Amino acid sequence: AVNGNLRFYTAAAGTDSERMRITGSGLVGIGTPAPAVPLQVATRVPSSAVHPNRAGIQAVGEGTDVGGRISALVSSTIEMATFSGYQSAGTLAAPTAVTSGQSLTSLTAFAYNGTQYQSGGNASINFVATEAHTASAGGAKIIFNTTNNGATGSTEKVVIDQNGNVGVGVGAPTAKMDVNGGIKQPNYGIISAVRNSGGVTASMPWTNAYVLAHQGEMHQWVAGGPILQDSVTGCNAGPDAGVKFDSIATSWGGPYKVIFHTTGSNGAIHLEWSGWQVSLKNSAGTELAIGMGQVFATLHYDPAVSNWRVEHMFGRINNTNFTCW
Amino acid sequence: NLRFYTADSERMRITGSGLVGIGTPAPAVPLQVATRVPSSAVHPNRAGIQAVGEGTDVGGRISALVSSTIEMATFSGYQSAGTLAAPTAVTSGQSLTSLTAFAYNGTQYQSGGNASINFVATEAHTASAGGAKIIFNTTNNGATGSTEKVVIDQNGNVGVGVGAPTAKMDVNGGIKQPNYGIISAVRNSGGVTASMPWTNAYVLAHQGEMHQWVAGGPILQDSVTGCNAGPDAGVKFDSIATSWGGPYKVIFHTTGSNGAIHLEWSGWQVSLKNSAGTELAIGMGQVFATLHYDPAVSNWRVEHMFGRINNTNFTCW
Amino acid sequence: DFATAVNGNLRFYTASERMRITGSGLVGIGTPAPAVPLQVATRVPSSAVHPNRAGIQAVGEGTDVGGRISALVSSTIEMATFSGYQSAGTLAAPTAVTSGQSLTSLTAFAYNGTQYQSGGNASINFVATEAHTASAGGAKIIFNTTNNGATGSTEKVVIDQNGNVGVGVGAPTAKMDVNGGIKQPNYGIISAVRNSGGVTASMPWTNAYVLAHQGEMHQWVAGGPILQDSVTGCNAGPDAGVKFDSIATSWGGPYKVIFHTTGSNGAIHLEWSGWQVSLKNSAGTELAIGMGQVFATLHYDPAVSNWRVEHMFGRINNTNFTCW
């Protein structure tokens, strides 16, 4: 067709108003007389706009259709599909540096409530400036806001600060993991490792491979006391040599604190537990004391015995101390 | 079909089927933009499609709208290796899609972005495997390049300051929780008194949660039914509030009808007292106790506890 | 140059309308009534194939940068946004969303030489936690990833409406509901000995660091610590000049160190249990050797230009010790 500019106007007699333009170079501008990208939409959208009409470009879908989706496609080993968010202060003609606390980009989800959409969004992942930007500083952070049930406004729940510190329910996390609440791990039940003349038995919630692939992990939880004993090799000597830390399963239980370690060829674990009710027994099986029991033990998977066994443990039944290596 | 040519390159096309192509003579979606944007492009002109806003306007926003119980609004990111004509499977470690934020600093934008959420391939993809991971990058104050701070790996393991998290929660630093003050649960002839930072309902709704912090020692005693048996029946772990304090370790549990807690504390100074109230020892104190909200007494009570004050052990059930 | 004008709407038909430039200045593709500067509504059926399952799509190749979609804003008030709108029913008649229904999603698709992964390879989704009304608009954020050797993204993390974050948990009851292990850095072995020969300490942290990381707990596995202060700190008590002489062994033990302060300097509460530890008096004679456990409160003392033990107590085998 044309050999240069191609502009579209509306109500020209009433008031000169350009709408779209196909430049000679091949760029398309909607609301902009000078597009800077293949397709630049600039028609002014005032604050008066109502949801879901508060945007420049919009795809739409319905029922089982898949048209209400926006995409970026790249077939390259070097580049990547991107959703770029550019932010600056001042104005487009004269862009100025962003200030500290200035929001840069946001991914907001709006939901209809039969009447309208939620002002401010129902859930937002935002990028915010952590400091006034300069040619020497471009600090930024990421925040995650969601709306509590029965509420109508998204609140900041998590933050990945410029320093890398993650804060849950914390605005300025000073810790690498600053939590404003409780920490919950899985309930791994009760542990058992008995090695006696009668045989070898063990109840371990993990497997040799798992522990070997999870070195340095701590697990804390609440459950009945453990039953531990090795009157033959691992727990063979010491002041109290063949003792059995015979825990009684109770509703009160106690807190297990187990961290993973290794022998260099097999999985090992450091276990700690305190609670009710525990009875200390000797190799013969006679009860020495019964009641509150506390214990620290170091168990490891022994392939020679095809099961887990205690290498050394020490603790206290009531006011009596026992050590067993 | 309707083509829009310039002098003699075709720029736009409205096909008979109703698809629109900008830079593509064969669009595959309602509106496909393909005009070549070379690497030479500078910010903020490095993109195929771009919305723009100004001041108080809301035009600089890109949206996807869906009215359906089945489908959902999506921002789809497709990535492949090779070329468009001959696309091939992605490689291990290859980036798939990214959500990047650029910020002007009065002269330019930060090359690489100031903060980005990226999706990366964890393995060479095939018909048998499509593993992927999510990374979160941010720029530190005084820096000019976004660095990977967090990662949700293909296995679900979250890594904070860790590239290959082997733990379900692999943190490369300290873990901090709220300071819950000092706890007290005394049941005496003088009365029933207790200072608990939580409420029965709260503990019942937070089972299995661990809380650690530093504060002055606790004051615990039950000299009537629970603790008044065993080696040291009436016993008071009379902790003195000191600057050094000690580390509390409290995990939530239950009786089946009310909240219970397992408490641990060590530090200085502590005074062991008997039911009569005479001091048996003073100094370093350690204790493990199991308290629980007893409605019959309308307050928290100690079910059973045992510890060591200085080098003397004490027990109470 | 060149241009064309119209007094009002301008429709394009290929039969039947495919595009339209309204009098107000809006452009609609597949919609006879656009509501934004550029509104695309051409119906895309479920039959569509990847990567053609979308209304609008940018494309890039090799070293080019056109496969990017962007939002630009130059304002102190507004910010670049990627708005995702979701409603029930239909576009003409939108209705409130249901509980648990997904609202918006950012999914990444990857080619496997034959096709793209149905459902996406990794997705950040926003989901409704309750039926919406004028009184409630509860929502949550989910993070889905695909395991190596798998072909479907699974929900790995969730930031619920209540702020509770879950790793491998659907309904996090804890602000940090983890369905697995928690691992921290291995800070080695700690040492703080103050004797007639002098004062020495092996601390993996700095006074400044500890002062700037108050209330943080660190747990790990390593050999036992070597602690003693026979001069000022642990100079009194039942066991006055004790040295908790740990022997470095493969079995080691679990350290539990939490940060505190004196009000002017960094302090720490340390706990350690394990094998093999030797109890020694100020003179240096071994009282016992074997299983050792200890609790200690150390702090950086500037008078000594190093870390020292203020008070410590524990047990070696069955014999108990305390010092302050």
Residue numbers in the entry:
A (entry chain A): 827 to 1151
B (entry chain B): 831 to 837, 842 to 1151
C (entry chain C): 823 to 837, 843 to 1151
The authors write:
Bdellovibrio bacteriovorus is a bacterium that preys upon a wide range of other Gram-negative bacteria, entering their periplasm and consuming them from within. Structural studies reveal a variety of domain usages (and therefore binding capabilities) at the fibre C-termini, placing these on intertwined trimeric β-prisms. Using independent but complementary approaches, we identified and characterized a MAT superfamily of trimeric fibre proteins with diverse adhesive tips, able to fulfil the long-sought-after role of multiplicity of molecular recognition and handling of diverse epitopes (across a wide prey range), by the bacterial predator B. bacteriovorus.
The tip of Bd1334 has no similarity to that of Bd2133, forming a β-sandwich of a completely different, square-like shape. A composite pocket is formed from two chains, making a tryptophan cage with W1078 and W1102 from one monomer and the terminal W1151 from the opposing monomer. W1102 has an unusual cis peptide bond often enriched in binding sites. There are no structural homologues for Bd1334 in the PDB, and sequence homologues are limited, with sequence conservation patterns being non-informative.
